[PDB]
Design a protein around this ligand. Structure first.
Ligand code: HEM
Length: 280
């Protein structure tokens, strides 16, 4: 059992986008890094029914990439609007203690909103990865629009998880007009634009309680004109894909890196990659 392990998370509100070409860049592997755990989350349209017959390409692309690197896919789960895959280096895995388990929680009759939680145990320490999806119009357990539900929060449990990450588009946005928001972006005033971000409001309403976001240094990841770097000012530029972290048992988690991946310009949102170090 090592003292520390590293985790990479990536999420993307990808819509109808297929898997892109350079996957090492997407998962933060393009500089020789060997993370112990990798988690990939999507939000979009039509995953489960797979009309585009895309799912077999996803498999081939992610197996080509990760099998030789020593990773085992612990779980892939898709719904019509969400996707969550967790990988872990094979060497850390004990079949007798893994206790690999996934839940899906949907809140609407159409099964478009709610979340996925995948959890697993290595070195007697339990990880949970959550992704979630909420739409503005939804009727919710919190009476807010935010993609939080206590059933997706494995810190609120009597045998809580050791290491938890929540990744995906939290339906948290910037609460100011677009004109002002674009002007703060042009001034590189990231912190001044962040003052209007809703995550702090959600936390006031006791949502995402005790969950932490790494310092944000990058410009809003949404809403872009596809295949350009131009904001479509029909929405207030915002931070849609986020990465949050927490321990349910007092463990130390340290963010190493948190960044948008602006080379992936194909749709209205940009992917977000985070890298962490956890102490067992
Ligand atoms: C940027 C876009 C996307 C990413 C990052 C993504 C990623 C993934 C990942 C990581 C898996 C698990 C791979 C593995 O077996 O190791 C997967 C599986 C899947 N993907 Fe995607 N994908 C995307 C787009 C799509 C789209 C657009 C569709 C359909 C409209 C789709 C349908 C599926 C299906 C059905 C599976 C299940 C595959 C199976 O187990 O046979 N994917 N994808």
């Amino acid at each position: 059992p090592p003292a520390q392990l590293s985790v990479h998370t990536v999420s993307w509100n990808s819509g109808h986008e297929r898997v892109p070409t350079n996957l090492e860049e997407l998962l933060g592997l393009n500089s020789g890094e060997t993370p112990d755990v990798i988690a990939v989350a999507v939000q979009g349209f039509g995953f489960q029914t797979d009309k585009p017959q895309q799912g077999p390409a996803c498999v081939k692309n992610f197996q080509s990439l990760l099998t030789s690197k020593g990773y085992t896919k612990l779980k892939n789960t898709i719904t019509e609007t969400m996707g969550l895959t967790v990988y872990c280096l094979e060497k850390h895995l004990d079949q007798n203690t893994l206790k690999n388990e996934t839940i899906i929680v949907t809140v609407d009759d159409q099964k478009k909103s709610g979340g996925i939680v995948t959890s697993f145990t290595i070195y007697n320490k339990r990880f949970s990865f959550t992704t979630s999806r909420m739409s503005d119009e939804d009727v919710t357990s919190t009476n807010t629009k935010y993609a939080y539900d206590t059933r997706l929060d494995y810190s609120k449990k009597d045998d809580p998880s050791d290491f938890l990450f929540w990744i995906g588009d939290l339906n948290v946005r910037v609460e100011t007009n677009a004109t002002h928001a674009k002007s703060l972006v042009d001034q590189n005033n990231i912190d001044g634009l962040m003052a209007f971000d809703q995550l702090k409001k959600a936390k006031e309403q006791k949502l995402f309680d005790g969950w932490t976001e790494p310092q944000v240094t990058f410009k809003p990841t949404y809403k872009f004109k596809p295949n350009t770097d131009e904001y479509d000012l029909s929405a207030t530029p915002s931070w849609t894909d986020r990465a949050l972290y927490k321990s349910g048992t007092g463990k130390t988690i340290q963010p190493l890196s948190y960044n948008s991946l602006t080379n992936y310009k194909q749709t209205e949102h940009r992917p977000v990659l985070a890298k962490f170090r956890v102490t067992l």
